Design an enzyme around this catalytic site. Structure first.
Site, PDB file in Angstrom:
ATOM      1  N   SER A 246       1.543  15.698   9.142  1.00 52.01           N
ATOM      2  CA  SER A 246       0.696  15.850   7.961  1.00 52.01           C
ATOM      3  C   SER A 246       0.244  14.431   7.538  1.00 52.01           C
ATOM      4  O   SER A 246       0.970  13.432   7.688  1.00 52.01           O
ATOM      5  CB  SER A 246       1.479  16.547   6.848  1.00 52.01           C
ATOM      6  OG  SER A 246       0.732  16.511   5.656  1.00 52.01           O
TER       7      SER A 246
ATOM      8  N   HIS B 133      -3.123  12.464  12.769  1.00 49.81           N
ATOM      9  CA  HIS B 133      -2.726  13.377  11.714  1.00 49.81           C
ATOM     10  C   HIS B 133      -3.299  14.775  11.896  1.00 49.81           C
ATOM     11  O   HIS B 133      -4.373  14.983  12.487  1.00 49.81           O
ATOM     12  CB  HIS B 133      -3.199  12.880  10.350  1.00 49.81           C
ATOM     13  CG  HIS B 133      -2.528  11.626   9.928  1.00 49.81           C
ATOM     14  ND1 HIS B 133      -3.014  10.810   8.926  1.00 49.81           N
ATOM     15  CD2 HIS B 133      -1.365  11.077  10.343  1.00 49.81           C
ATOM     16  CE1 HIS B 133      -2.164   9.814   8.745  1.00 49.81           C
ATOM     17  NE2 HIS B 133      -1.153   9.950   9.592  1.00 49.81           N
TER      18      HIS B 133
ATOM     19  N   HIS C 199       2.969   9.391  16.451  1.00 53.17           N
ATOM     20  CA  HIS C 199       1.795   8.531  16.674  1.00 53.17           C
ATOM     21  C   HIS C 199       1.948   7.777  17.974  1.00 53.17           C
ATOM     22  O   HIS C 199       0.991   7.678  18.745  1.00 53.17           O
ATOM     23  CB  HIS C 199       1.658   7.491  15.543  1.00 53.17           C
ATOM     24  CG  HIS C 199       1.033   8.016  14.285  1.00 53.17           C
ATOM     25  ND1 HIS C 199      -0.155   8.720  14.264  1.00 53.17           N
ATOM     26  CD2 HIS C 199       1.379   7.841  12.988  1.00 53.17           C
ATOM     27  CE1 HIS C 199      -0.518   8.940  13.010  1.00 53.17           C
ATOM     28  NE2 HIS C 199       0.393   8.411  12.209  1.00 53.17           N
TER      29      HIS C 199
ATOM     30  N   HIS D 127       7.484  11.024  12.620  1.00 50.33           N
ATOM     31  CA  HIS D 127       6.030  10.943  12.431  1.00 50.33           C
ATOM     32  C   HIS D 127       5.525   9.703  13.170  1.00 50.33           C
ATOM     33  O   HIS D 127       4.512   9.773  13.892  1.00 50.33           O
ATOM     34  CB  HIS D 127       5.745  10.850  10.933  1.00 50.33           C
ATOM     35  CG  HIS D 127       4.294  10.668  10.592  1.00 50.33           C
ATOM     36  ND1 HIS D 127       3.508  11.708  10.135  1.00 50.33           N
ATOM     37  CD2 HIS D 127       3.502   9.565  10.587  1.00 50.33           C
ATOM     38  CE1 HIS D 127       2.288  11.258   9.878  1.00 50.33           C
ATOM     39  NE2 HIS D 127       2.252   9.953  10.133  1.00 50.33           N
ATOM     40  N   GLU D 128       6.210   8.556  13.017  1.00 55.76           N
ATOM     41  CA  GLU D 128       5.755   7.353  13.724  1.00 55.76           C
ATOM     42  C   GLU D 128       5.931   7.479  15.249  1.00 55.76           C
ATOM     43  O   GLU D 128       5.067   7.060  16.034  1.00 55.76           O
ATOM     44  CB  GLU D 128       6.463   6.109  13.161  1.00 55.76           C
ATOM     45  CG  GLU D 128       6.303   5.911  11.630  1.00 55.76           C
ATOM     46  CD  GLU D 128       4.878   5.957  11.109  1.00 55.76           C
ATOM     47  OE1 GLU D 128       4.719   6.277   9.892  1.00 55.76           O
ATOM     48  OE2 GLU D 128       3.931   5.708  11.889  1.00 55.76           O
TER      49      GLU D 128
ATOM     50  N   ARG E 132       0.794  -1.223   0.000  1.00 56.83           N
ATOM     51  CA  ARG E 132       0.000   0.000   0.000  1.00 56.83           C
ATOM     52  C   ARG E 132       0.819   1.262   0.000  1.00 56.83           C
ATOM     53  O   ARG E 132       0.364   2.301   0.469  1.00 56.83           O
ATOM     54  CB  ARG E 132      -0.966  -0.066   1.176  1.00 56.83           C
ATOM     55  CG  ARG E 132      -1.776  -1.362   1.147  1.00 56.83           C
ATOM     56  CD  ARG E 132      -3.210  -1.168   1.580  1.00 56.83           C
ATOM     57  NE  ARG E 132      -3.345  -0.370   2.790  1.00 56.83           N
ATOM     58  CZ  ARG E 132      -4.511  -0.063   3.355  1.00 56.83           C
ATOM     59  NH1 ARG E 132      -5.644  -0.489   2.813  1.00 56.83           N
ATOM     60  NH2 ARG E 132      -4.548   0.659   4.466  1.00 56.83           N
ATOM     61  N   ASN E 133       2.017   1.172  -0.567  1.00 48.84           N
ATOM     62  CA  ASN E 133       2.938   2.278  -0.685  1.00 48.84           C
ATOM     63  C   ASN E 133       3.229   2.848   0.679  1.00 48.84           C
ATOM     64  O   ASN E 133       3.400   4.054   0.836  1.00 48.84           O
ATOM     65  CB  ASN E 133       2.345   3.351  -1.592  1.00 48.84           C
ATOM     66  CG  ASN E 133       3.392   4.100  -2.323  1.00 48.84           C
ATOM     67  OD1 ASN E 133       4.473   3.569  -2.593  1.00 48.84           O
ATOM     68  ND2 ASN E 133       3.082   5.339  -2.700  1.00 48.84           N
ATOM     69  N   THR E 134       3.321   1.961   1.659  1.00 47.18           N
ATOM     70  CA  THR E 134       3.575   2.378   3.049  1.00 47.18           C
ATOM     71  C   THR E 134       5.050   2.594   3.320  1.00 47.18           C
ATOM     72  O   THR E 134       5.893   1.781   2.904  1.00 47.18           O
ATOM     73  CB  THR E 134       3.029   1.320   4.029  1.00 47.18           C
ATOM     74  OG1 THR E 134       1.608   1.231   3.846  1.00 47.18           O
ATOM     75  CG2 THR E 134       3.343   1.654   5.496  1.00 47.18           C
ATOM     76  N   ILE E 135       5.364   3.732   3.953  1.00 44.95           N
ATOM     77  CA  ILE E 135       6.737   4.076   4.281  1.00 44.95           C
ATOM     78  C   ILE E 135       6.988   4.043   5.792  1.00 44.95           C
ATOM     79  O   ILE E 135       8.124   4.121   6.206  1.00 44.95           O
ATOM     80  CB  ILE E 135       7.147   5.473   3.716  1.00 44.95           C
ATOM     81  CG1 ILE E 135       6.227   6.573   4.240  1.00 44.95           C
ATOM     82  CG2 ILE E 135       7.127   5.432   2.150  1.00 44.95           C
ATOM     83  CD1 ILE E 135       6.749   7.998   3.833  1.00 44.95           C
TER      84      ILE E 135
END
Length: 201
Positions: free
Chosen positions: A166, A152, A146, A142-143, A105-108
């Site tokens: 973002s 977000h 969370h 970012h992680e 799922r184009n997860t980074i």
């Protein structure tokens, strides 16, 4: 300072695929990881959280878990291994697995929300998805955000367009946390206030 002092002792695990990607060169990998941590530390400066690298583990022989396409599944396997093996090597507050896996799922990046300090859930998985160190470091941040209870950014709540939380990363990614993010962190310190990050190294 808007926030009281906190400390996050990180463990960073570099998988075998990433080891291979960087020509099986431990020195080069360690330098890259340190540059990432220096950026995470810079980004957390306005939250008054001192970030340190407590442990670096490079899987130079083989992967100890099945680092697969589904990021959440990989995260669960990593949290298990982190609790059962990594925490036994050296105590730390949060661990991130860095990999070159082409996550589905184009997860980074992916992490559990608001579970900082939890033995199994204080983890994130991050793809080394750019040659630009900052782009990977802001994904790690970012992680981490969370895991500190941040969701977000939402335009009704705050106006920042390119802040760390973002909904989607961009080429113009900022190194700043939005007011949405700071407000979520305040909520986390008030309602959860995990003990491990109150402890300085």
């Amino acid at each position: 300072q808007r926030f009281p002092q906190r400390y996050i002792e990180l463990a960073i695990v570099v998988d075998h695929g990433m080891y291979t990607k960087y020509s099986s060169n431990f020195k080069k990998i360690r330098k890259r990881v340190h540059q990432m941590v220096s950026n995470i530390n810079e980004m957390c400066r306005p939250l008054n959280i001192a970030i340190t690298l407590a442990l670096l583990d490079v899987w130079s022989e083989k992967d100890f878990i099945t680092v697969q396409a589904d990021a959440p599944t990989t995260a669960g396997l990593f949290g298990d291994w982190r609790e059962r093996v990594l925490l036994k090597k050296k105590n730390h507050d949060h661990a991130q697995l860095l990999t070159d896996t082409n996550f589905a799922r184009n997860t980074i990046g992916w992490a559990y929300v608001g579970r900082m300090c939890d033995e199994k859930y204080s983890v994130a998985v991050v793809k080394d998805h750019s040659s630009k160190v900052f782009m990977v470091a802001v994904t790690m941040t970012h992680e981490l955000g969370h895991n500190l209870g941040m969701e977000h950014d939402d335009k009704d709540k705050c106006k920042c367009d390119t802040c760390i939380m973002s909904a989607v990363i961009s080429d113009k990614q900022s190194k700043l946390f939005s007011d949405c993010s700071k407000d979520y962190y305040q909520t986390f310190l008030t309602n959860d206030n995990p003990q491990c990050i109150l402890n300085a190294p």
